[PDB]
Amino acid sequence: FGLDLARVETLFKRELRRFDELHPRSAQAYRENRRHWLYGAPLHWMQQWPGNCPLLVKEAQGARVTDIDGQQYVDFALGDSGAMFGHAQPAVADAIARQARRGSTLMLPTEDSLWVGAELARRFGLPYWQVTTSATDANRFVLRLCRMLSGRDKVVVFNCNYHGSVDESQVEFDAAGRMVPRAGVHPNGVRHATTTRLVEFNDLDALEAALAHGDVAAVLTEPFMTNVGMVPPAEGFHAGLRELTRRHDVALIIDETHTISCGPAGYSGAHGLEPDFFVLGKCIAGGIPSAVWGCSQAQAERIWAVLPHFRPGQAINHFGFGGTLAGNALQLAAMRATFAEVMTEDAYRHMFQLAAQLEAGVRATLEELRLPWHVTRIGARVEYLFMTHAPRNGGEAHHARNGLIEACLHLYLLNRGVLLTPFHNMALTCPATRAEDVELHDRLLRDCLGELL
Amino acid sequence: FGLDLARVETLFKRELRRFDELHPRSAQAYRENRRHWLYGAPLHWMQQWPGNCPLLVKEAQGARVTDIDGQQYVDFALGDSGAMFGHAQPAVADAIARQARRGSTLMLPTEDSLWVGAELARRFGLPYWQVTTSATDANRFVLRLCRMLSGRDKVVVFNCNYHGSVDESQVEFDAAGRMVPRAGVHPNGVRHATTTRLVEFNDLDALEAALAHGDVAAVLTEPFMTNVGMVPPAEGFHAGLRELTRRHDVALIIDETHTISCGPAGYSGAHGLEPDFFVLGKCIAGGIPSAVWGCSQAQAERIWAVLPHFRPGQAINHFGFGGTLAGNALQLAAMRATFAEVMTEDAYRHMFQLAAQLEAGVRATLEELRLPWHVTRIGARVEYLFMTHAPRNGGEAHHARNGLIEACLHLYLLNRGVLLTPFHNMALTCPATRAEDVELHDRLLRDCLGELL
């Protein structure tokens, strides 16, 4: 990857010692938290920050975080996109506080549901919506409904996708081109040959061959892959994807949980896509677990004919999906504030300007140092990969990842006051990001890479 | 069932008209919400309230709800248990408001995690914990870990269980005693013979026969069934369940999402159960979607052996579970307030007094009217079933449910100011419930049943 791995290891060890010295109270907290949390924090992913323990946060506002050791950071991680529009957005926090004090969960709608339903249809261009407690659940539930409406059992996913804890998606290609369980993800009692057809992104011939079996209920995809580094769609890919799925009467599900970085209507709105289903989680409810999903009228009519509107006196049933706290008053209040006050054209304009600045800086560093790496931007979200050219598909991209180099870069920045999400080589801008914060990122990355070379 | 169904239909039709007359603004709202929500509200379950639409809530506090028509209710539904300790509990709402203003989701712990971890271990008597965004997810993720640690693929569940949108649980017995997909729940590409063994509750011989195949990773159960009416465990059943699962090296997962009504440490802490895993969602975070799960020391050691603590520089992986907003700062603040200030001995004592009063009142009415029905209480939660004696198992219980009678009783009460969850024949008390609220329930139920007889 253009670096001396011994120099990376040397720097990394020094930065691990620096991390211990700078964050003693977080380290003390980790010793205590390891006594009662299975993985030393409430979520096992939190163990995967670089450094010997996760930081404990004292407070955060906008793009600023302060830890319990008093260290201050500019935050480009933003809750791994859960806080994409910044921490503690005042309209959203105010809406959450107000609604909590007048009922958070009633198993009933409020007036905010009226506003949000109409907003979702206006913004995202599909008429009918539902709310879940996570993007994962939106994907699971849409796939169930697609199986119900179509009578077909298989879902197409793309190699090196991520759609959450959707077990049918947890597959990869092995060296022989066979679909096998994703590395490190147990098959969990699923035989994926019965549930899933796997294809590489940007391969219309392979997609045709998969759909032609006649057993595919849906294609589930990001419109631009973001969970193996960034994989842009090739020229003509979306048009082909849309055409093939129409021809084979296969649902096209577009998951914008990350690609909502592209604009206020997502990638789909910015590029004229025509999804059958649209999924969006992570960032829309101020840090309350939530997602929305939407569908076309044509899909809605097929769903209603296999799951009719409930009749008076009918036997109660969940029908295998929904959730007790899904679509609750608190979620809807937070969503209303987010869509009305936060996810605006002006907000995105600012985010794009700062993200473009960050992208240009990374690119200049990669060019100057002659690294065989590249950087990509989708709106507010910027990521680099350790290969010379943009990947054609997820399988290609996967080879351009490295745990040690990633940990070293991330920790060097962390110890000097910049947080990057540990799961990506990405930076995300929000309305509170300032030009100085981008300059600090840029300088620190350049310093780190220069020390390595 | 001891009622003439034509008389029930007649009363129900009258109450449907009454509902329309009393709630015109909610009906107007429904017409609009059906344009933008697939099932006319954010969550499709909300269509299953009786009456021609779900009520739109204006505000709620404690056990009091006011709708957008200005109608006032006493609430024994409490968000279908999501608001078990009342609406707008002041310490929990204050904690949510405060935390929203200082960072709600950071992909990092806060100091609240220190207190909450220690509290969960103290309260529930298992040492190690994790947080999810729902009870469903806690169940799914525990089952994945049990498959990983055991190398076995099957889960045992009980007929007419409910554990959330856990696909492997969605089975029932047909008329021949064969395991088939649960009515109204599509198999979703699963062949359940490969994932699931089904037994009736309170049947140790059948349980032994299922475990003896050597292919069961776990038994998943409520300790007292609450989702088909109430099915108490028989004398000696828990002792047998614990012993058989030990003998077969099978994990016992106890789901307390409802049975937390039994007391501050759940049914398990009242009755000396020895769960390998303990799951609790719905009510612990003030209406923020959340759940916890805990495991024994012995299970922790087996999990760490298959999924070791993350190492610096290791390649990132979710391993198939967790979620982006799981274990977040906002959830932890709400849980801390709940466990510290809300789920107290005094709260439970109040809840039990009012629930015992409600139970005794229902029973007096059933006995006076000579209905072939019975009522059961587990702590704060009271439910009747349309059969003379407590059911021995879920299959028996399922025959003593009836959509039309249930809708009629629920609507009669709703139109006269008492909310009951539409999915059960249950009433739940909270610290804000008042004696007069119980008296109103008692009188209205007696009036309804008297009109029918």
As a whole number of Å, the CA-based R_g of chain A is: 22
Q: Which of B55, B58, B65, B108 to probe by mutation at the A interface, max A CB count within 10 Å?
A: B108
Closest by CA position to B231, among listed B84, B374, B408: B374
Buried b (16+ CB within 10 A) or exposed e, B113-146: bbbbbebbbebbbbbbbbbbbbbbbbbbbbbbbb
Place of tokens 């407070």: A59
Chain A interface includes B317 (CB < 8 A):
yes
Chain A interface includes B41 (CB < 8 A):
yes
Window B:65-124, CB contacts with A under 8 Å: 65, 68, 75, 77, 79-83, 87-88, 92-93, 96-97, 100-111, 113-114, 116-118, 120-121
Entry field: residues in chain B = 453
- Which structural technique was applied? X-ray
Give CA–CA dist B87/B349, Å, rounded: 19
Q: Any bridge partners for residue B225, and if so which?
A: B231
CB A239 within 8 A of CB A203: no
Give CA–CA dist B352/A92, Å, rounded: 37
CB contact under 8 A, B32 and A114: yes
Give CA–CA dist A16/A410, Å, rounded: 11
Q: Any bridge partners for residue A419, and if so which?
A: A75
> What is Dmax (Cα atoms) for chain B?
73
- Contacting residues of B for A167, CB less than 8 Å apart: 320
User: What are the residue boundaries of the structural domains of chain B, listed by start?
Assistant: 1-88+347-453, 89-346
**Tokens for B193?**
């013979």
Cα dihedral A418→A422→A423→A427 (10° resolution): 0
Chain A to chain B, count of Cβ pairs less than 8 Å apart?
Answer: 483
CB contact under 8 A, B109 and A403: no
Work out the end-to-end distance of chain B between its first and last CA atoms, rounded to an integer number of angstroms: 12
Q: How many CB atoms lie within 10 A of CB A244?
A: 18
The vertex-B210 CA angle with B208 and B215, nearest 5°, equals 120
Resolution in Å, one decimal place? 1.4
Rounded to an integer, what is the distance from CA B12 to the centroid of its chain?
Answer: 27
- Estimate the crossing angle of helix B329-337 against helix B112-124, to 10 degrees: 50
Give CA–CA dist A152/A86, Å, rounded: 41
Closest by CA position to B292, among listed A161, A42, A253, A85: A42
Q: B218 Cβ partners below 8 Å, 6+ apart?
A: B142, B143, B146, B150, B155, B156, B250, B251, B252, B253, B276, B277
- Contacting residues of B for A60, CB less than 8 Å apart: 102-103, 106
- Contacting residues of B for A195, CB less than 8 Å apart: 189
Place of tokens 């015992």: B356
Q: How many CB atoms lie within 10 A of CB B309?
A: 12
Q: In chain A, after which residues is the C-to-N distance over 2.5 Å, breaking the chain?
A: none
Residue B78 exposed, middle or buried by CB count within 10 Å (0-12, 13-18, 19+) = buried
CB contact under 8 A, B103 and A109: no
Residue from the list B79, B110, B165 with its beta carbon closest to the beta carbon of A106: B79
Closest by CA position to B114, among listed A54, A137, A268: A54
Three-class DSSP labels, chain A = CCCCHHHHHHHHHHHHHHHHHHCHHHHHHHHHHCCCECCCCCCHHHHHCCCCCCCCEEEEEECEEEECCCCEEEECCCCCCCCCCCECCHHHHHHHHHHHCCCCCCCCCEHHHHHHHHHHHHHHCCCEEEEECCHHHHHHHHHHHHHHHHCCCEEEEECCCCCCCCHHHCEEECCCCCEEECCCCCCCCCCHHHCEEEECCCCHHHHHHHHCCCCEEEEEECCCECCCCCECCCCCHHHHHHHHHHHCCCEEEEECCCHHHHCCCHHHHHHCCCCCEEEEECCCCCCCCCEEEEECHHHHHHHHHHCCCCCCCCCCCCCCCCCCCCCCHHHHHHHHHHHHHHCCHHHHHHHHHHHHHHHHHHHHHHHHCCCCCEEEEECCEEEEECCCCCCCCHHHHHCCCCHHHHHHHHHHHHCCCEECCCCCCEEECCCCCCHHHHHHHHHHHHHHHHHHC
Three-class DSSP labels, chain B = CCCCHHHHHHHHHHHHHHHHHHCHHHHHHHHHHHHHECCCCCCHHHHHCCCCCCCCEEEEEECEEEECCCCEEEECCCCCCCCCCCECCHHHHHHHHHHHCCCCCCCCCECHHHHHHHHHHHHHCCCEEEEECCHHHHHHHHHHHHHHHHCCCEEEEECCCCCCCCHHHCEEECCCCCEEECCCCCCCCCCHHHCEEEECCCCHHHHHHHHCCCCEEEEEECCCECCCCCECCCCCHHHHHHHHHHHCCCEEEEECCCHHHHCCCHHHHHHCCCCCEEEEECCCCCCCCCEEEEECHHHHHHHHHHCCCCCCCCCCCCCCCCCCCCCCHHHHHHHHHHHHHHCCHHHHHHHHHHHHHHHHHHHHHHHHHCCCCEEEEECCEEEEECCCCCCCCHHHHHCCCCHHHHHHHHHHHHCCCEECCCCCCEEECCCCCCHHHHHHHHHHHHHHHHHHC
Q: Which of A325, A336, A419 to probe by mutation at the B interface, max B CB count within 10 Å?
A: A325
Residue from the list B133, B282, B321 with its beta carbon closest to the beta carbon of A289: B133
As a whole number of Å, the CA-based R_g of chain B is: 22
Give CA–CA dist A149/A296, Å, rounded: 13
Window A:161-220, CB contacts with B under 8 Å: 162, 164-165, 167-168, 170, 182-186, 188-189, 191, 194-195
Residue from the list B57, B295, B312 with its beta carbon closest to the beta carbon of A407: B312
Chain B interface includes A156 (CB < 8 A):
no
Give CA–CA dist B340/B120, Å, rounded: 11
Q: How many CB atoms lie within 10 A of CB B272?
A: 10
Chain B interface includes A54 (CB < 8 A):
yes
CB B236 within 8 A of CB B271: no
- Measured CA to CA in angstroms, residue B214 lies from B152, B208, B210, B217, B245 at distances of 8, 11, 8, 9, 11
Side-by-side strand order, sheet with B57-61: B57-61, B64-67, B72-75, B418-419
**Tokens for B174?**
């047909």
Give CA–CA dist A52/A72, Å, rounded: 18
Residue from the list A65, A88, A104 with its beta carbon closest to the beta carbon of B287: A104
Q: Any bridge partners for residue B385, and if so which?
A: B374
Q: CA nearest B57 in A: which residue?
A: A110
**Tokens for A330?**
């608190």
- Measured CA to CA in angstroms, residue B149 lies from B215, B255, B300 at distances of 13, 20, 10
Entry field: residues in chain A = 453
Count of alpha carbons within 13 angstroms of residue B48, beta-carbon side: 21
**Tokens for B344?**
């107290």
Q: CA nearest B48 in A: which residue?
A: A310
Give CA–CA dist A238/A269, Å, rounded: 13
Rounded to an integer, what is the distance from CA B317 to the centroid of its chain?
Answer: 31
- Contacting residues of A for B56, CB less than 8 Å apart: 108-111, 113-114
Identity of the residue numbered A246: R
